[PDB]
Design a protein around this ligand. Sequence first.
Ligand code: 6VD
Ligand code: NA
Lengths: 246, 10
Amino acid sequence: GASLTEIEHLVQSVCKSYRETCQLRLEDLLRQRSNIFSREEVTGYQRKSMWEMWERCAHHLTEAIQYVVEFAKRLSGFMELCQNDQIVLLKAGAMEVVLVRMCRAYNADNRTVFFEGKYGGMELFRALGCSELISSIFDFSHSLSALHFSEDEIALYTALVLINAHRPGLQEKRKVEQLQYNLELAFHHHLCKTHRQSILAKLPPKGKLRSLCSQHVERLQIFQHLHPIVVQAAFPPLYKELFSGG
Amino acid sequence: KILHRLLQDS
Ligand SMILES: CCc1cc(O)c2ccccc2n1
Ligand code: NA
């Protein structure tokens, strides 16, 4: 039973937790927009082996996930849930938060994403052999970029993506519903205060984030069948914990 | 293993 004063404190707390756990400052990503991979560099990426490209991408995803774990740990009320629930929420939601955070590193003007120090198009990722997954992620990032999120809106929205009381496996489901309700109030209060309530209808449905995560696990399984020793010997242990089952 | 360690490391 949170009050208006407590709701405003929650807004500031979430926004602070987010700013502290950004891998890249938004200003740094915007200032790098003219730093684009040349045609020779794109060709170099396309000539990389499928296994080398998968390992590089899994490493980059793992680094991004580590920041999401830290965001969760700083998130008001998350560390108060039992460890089983903390792990359920991170296993189901870490990739979804990374997918939303990715729109900051996406330049809708030329359809490029910041990857390994420069901006490149989806053609940079051709060696992975998961064209449908890559194009869906780029489409998703393009659609989110059209919302023109502020950093505070991403902070509030990503807190809600993570604190989802519907995840299967939660033991303290009511405690999570209460935290989710308070974060929903904080988010909707901020939108109301900044006259941005129009974005509510424009946010992706939860099924969209679920579809993208499911496609990622499916393409990982195909790669794992082709190069099992690459996954075992060369994929990050956190990545295997979240997406292979250890 | 990893997730438990990250969550415990204060
Ligand atoms: C109009 C609702 C809607 C539906 C989607 O699939 C979206 C996908 C990405 C971003 C925003 C989205 N918004
Ligand atoms: Na963007």
